[PDB]
Design a protein around this ligand. Sequence first.
Ligand code: NA
Ligand code: NA
Ligand code: NA
Ligand code: NA
Lengths: 365, 365, 365, 365
Amino acid sequence: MKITKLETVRVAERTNLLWVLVHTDEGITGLGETFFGAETVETYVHEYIAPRVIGRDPLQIDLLAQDLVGYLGFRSSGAEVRGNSAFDIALWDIFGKATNQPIAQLLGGFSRREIRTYNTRADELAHSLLEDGITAMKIWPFDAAAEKTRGQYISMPDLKSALEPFEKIRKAVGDKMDIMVEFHSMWQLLPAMQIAKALTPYQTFWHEDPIKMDSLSSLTRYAAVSPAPISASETLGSRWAFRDLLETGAAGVVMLDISWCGGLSEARKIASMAEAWHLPVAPHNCTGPVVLCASTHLSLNAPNALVQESVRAFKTWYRDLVTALPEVKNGMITVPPGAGLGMELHPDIEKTFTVSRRFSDAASI
Amino acid sequence: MKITKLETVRVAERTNLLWVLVHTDEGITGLGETFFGAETVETYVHEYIAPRVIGRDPLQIDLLAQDLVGYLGFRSSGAEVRGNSAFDIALWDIFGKATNQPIAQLLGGFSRREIRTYNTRADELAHSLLEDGITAMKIWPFDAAAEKTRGQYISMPDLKSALEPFEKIRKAVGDKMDIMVEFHSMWQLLPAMQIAKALTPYQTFWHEDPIKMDSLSSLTRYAAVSPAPISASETLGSRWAFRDLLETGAAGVVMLDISWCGGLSEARKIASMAEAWHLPVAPHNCTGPVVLCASTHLSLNAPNALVQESVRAFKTWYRDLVTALPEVKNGMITVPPGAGLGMELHPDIEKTFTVSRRFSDAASI
Amino acid sequence: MKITKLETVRVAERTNLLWVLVHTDEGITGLGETFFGAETVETYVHEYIAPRVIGRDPLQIDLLAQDLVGYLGFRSSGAEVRGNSAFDIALWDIFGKATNQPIAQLLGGFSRREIRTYNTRADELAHSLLEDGITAMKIWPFDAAAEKTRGQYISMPDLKSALEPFEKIRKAVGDKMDIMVEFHSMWQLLPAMQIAKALTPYQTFWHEDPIKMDSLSSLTRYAAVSPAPISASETLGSRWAFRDLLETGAAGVVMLDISWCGGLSEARKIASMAEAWHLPVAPHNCTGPVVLCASTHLSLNAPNALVQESVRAFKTWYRDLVTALPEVKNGMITVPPGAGLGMELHPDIEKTFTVSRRFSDAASI
Amino acid sequence: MKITKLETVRVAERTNLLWVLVHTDEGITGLGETFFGAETVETYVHEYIAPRVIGRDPLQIDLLAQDLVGYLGFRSSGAEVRGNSAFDIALWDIFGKATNQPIAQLLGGFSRREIRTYNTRADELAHSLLEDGITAMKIWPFDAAAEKTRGQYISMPDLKSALEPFEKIRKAVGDKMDIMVEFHSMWQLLPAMQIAKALTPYQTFWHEDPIKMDSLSSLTRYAAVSPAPISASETLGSRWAFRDLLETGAAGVVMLDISWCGGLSEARKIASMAEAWHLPVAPHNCTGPVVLCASTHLSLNAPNALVQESVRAFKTWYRDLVTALPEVKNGMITVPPGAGLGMELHPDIEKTFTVSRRFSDAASI
Ligand code: NA
Ligand code: NA
Ligand code: NA
Ligand code: NA
């Protein structure tokens, strides 16, 4: 088969989201998704991807991924990579539909049928999660302090205040809850290390993006004092960035976002390489439903997948965007049934959302 | 003063080019430029930069550069960075106009008044250049072979064929011409090293982008066998990428493109850091006239600027786009006179080009 | 314009201070300053700087800095460098006056309008500072013990005695005060590490110049045991010394003195390079008013400036030496208004001080 | 005994020279010397050294060296260190006179009675030297090219021209002459390595100060390609700088100047440490006669002294400055006879030179 059209879809109600639909002459349409800079990525899909892929065989997935690597903007989570990644997800969906297989099967099989999830006042929240069988939660109580000083400095009173949610969670549920800490890359090295040390009494599970992930060698000093492994990083793109991370000797939980890192194609290879380093992988969600779903496929396949992040009670607009969703039961998530992703865009989404679409085909490129 | 409008300009005749014009309430308009993915970068300028900078003081240059660093797409030459870089150039133009000073002065002064240039059959070309006082030339005769095998392999006969231009240049002008070799990041490590060794008899001046610049530690092995220093890399963005390059112990000629690396703001800091490593800087051109001009300002200021690349006889469409150009005399280039860049977009460019413009202001953001 | 005269000024009441005034044919006079060995540095200004700079264009700042680097005495805080640094400050003052811009603007803009300051019995002092909005203080209670043994040894009873101010401060104000520790490079490595470990219970903010800064690789062992980052070092000169510091992997707070390190010219480049390492900069004061002022300009520009040290109630002789001073309000310091530094030597200082002046011009060199 | 007066002496005919005379209550006067910035160093001797040493026992040499190390300006060849070094030489002269022993004896004995020397058109010069028994010569034919580009670049034709003296020497005397190459720290790293490689066919003996000695880690890359050992460096001061040099793994011939590095006190310790690394020492001369003499004492003592540089036919003004000189016979140099240095300032030097003197004593400090 051959790719005939590239379609992009946006909704005014959720301006960070972009869907990319890859149409074929066989009528198999693949669905992909990415997040942030949706207008910019959309322009890129039509300016750059379309002229390179219309007429091409979508089943040559590794080749198409190679063919879209830019002279500029590679090894990053920039707009070009986000567009390439959404496109790659759509190819995996096509491949699944063409073979009548779920994506997890095409990756190498369902190594597990479900995987533990985690979700993002604190003590009450922890209690509610536990009773629903969720035993990990991620919080980011240092972000407000970071904004005050652009991450250069944290006063001891502000540090003490930011530690209070940890105290409250531990008082409420003790050791029954893993507590992940998100820092959103907002700190410079010295206050990051100061905060890391201060977190010691709370038995934190991971410290995610404690500093900006731009010169990774800085992580060695952080790892020297941190009481929890570094979780890094949804902000990094391509297996080459993850080689660089592994080469630091400081890598911990290997985080990635399939829509920001080069697609399922790069993500699957990052995962198997992390396993070579005896490390786990934890694919990022809480963005769109397609990324959650495709990430869940990856997490069911990769033997070293540790947890699959998800949205609490994702009763949300997710169910209005797509035809089916991954299901969570007793703190475990699994894929919707069926070939490819196991989901399509919801019929007439124009009834619920303010939809805009753009198309490229042989005549427009 | 305050920024009032962001204007982007494209021309159908030169689809890789984008101009960004920053208007102020004082009527001082700054001009910036970048290259590649012009539609994508344009969308980004209006989607992301405009809402963050309308109403802001353009003279807080370092602060505005910081404020535009993305959560994603940083430390790269991707679309976001290219837009940020064009914007930064425009701020330096405003600052120069506001102070009645050329950009080179605002960077720390004219350390030189002009700088040697270089240009990109071979033997005849070399002869012509020399007689015009140009004593360096850059060629890329391995690109055809790279395309054949996606850079995995080069046959010895194809290697021998690609060496012929070097033979012809040396036979023609001997040692009077520096020969730079461009590889456009098209080779994997092993054939890159094979080619490097084979170039030994020709006394090459630098080997530019011999491999992809995505995991820089690979450069240490290349430097171990290369008879010429590594020139790296117009494809890298932000001072953090250049820290990573310097940390390899393999850095040579430090190359950057001001419109791809974070603007004059990042470039000036990359240059002074390269000097700390006893290395030179060589800003990239042959793209648009504004980048050539702003790069020349940087090259006149930075004590470690080695050469400033330029277009042979840039009698080209350059003179139709802008009001003045850098001048080359006896193989040396200098800036056009005046405050800021010393150039503006040519009046009624709509007469020569097919122009499209887009604007953001307080009402549109 | 051209430099016409170099003037040095000393006052008998403050024998460590030296002012350097750079006169021009346009009548714009730049003011610079340095500290320690004022007679020696004065001799150097006239012996070495004057014959090299009379007749030169003062706006070529980077070039003049390069032209004054010595064959001997470079990469240091010695007399030649101190003279060069005072001269460099005066050039920045001229450049500001010529452009009607504050120095902070010429560095790249006011990234902030004010910056937190810090000052140098203990418990009462801490209380007074806090109520004036000052939340950091620096003390050096180990210096007496160091003098006793030339830094080779500290007895446990003497160590316990030197810890008492920390106890008293913490008992008084708890965690509300950052406590910086100054060691004045007075200790050898082993007792420095012993002291560092002993300081752990007091949550110190930084450990400044814990050992002599002459073979920087020794800092790696110190950093391995220190509960606070190393602050280093006002005693180091030129960006090359700071490269060496960064290369140790032990760098923390990057300290410099603009009048000891190569001027604003070297300092600005040191700052941007420290930022590449995710580290902050903290310019040294408590010397003369011009250094305090020029340092404040640097601290308002550099995005990674952490704090700007100042003199408590600098009601001192500072106000008799110069026409205006940086102002402190609620623990934050900012520059005096106006172009360049925003200050000149006070008119007829001969009324308050015992002034000596020496001049060089075209006829004397 | 106790130091009673410090006397400095300059002569208008040789403005780079400074003598320091240390008078004692026993009437034993020690003579020291340094070179460059004579007025500046003189001011320092009286401003800083005098108040610290008048009344002190001159025989506590190691202690006095320690007591003069500055808070600033240490680990350098700056003015303070040059003054300290001249003072230290004078102390060794006093110690020799007090004990009726030559300095070489007080260092640990005459390990040799004489040592090979070297001197600084080329082919004729080489011939003349050989016939006088001198079998090493040092030249600096790249300095002119360095000045043209501030050491950033050398054209291949200029490189070829600078190689001609090597060709001429080798054609004249073949392998009978060691050829040392001096670079005076004038080159950046890349052209330094280019030049080093080009020197391969000429069997050079050492490559002295090929780059600036400010961040020594750069030397590792130079040593990787150089066909001759690095000679480094008369520009470095104190044993701590030489530790840093040795730690690079690139050290070769260890060069020092006793009047620039901390005196005979630092120099003797640098020498024994170089021997621990299996490396030789080569003390710098061609400055003043006292430095030549004291260096010769060091070279007769240190088992790893390789050669002692000297002035060709030093029939020069040397014999008018001092009472006796080291003697060269058949290419070997030895000390003048007698205690201490074996020389004093020539009686009534005021008859031959335009002499200026300054004194400090108990009443002036
Ligand atoms: Na995250
Ligand atoms: Na290139
Ligand atoms: Na200090
Ligand atoms: Na020399």
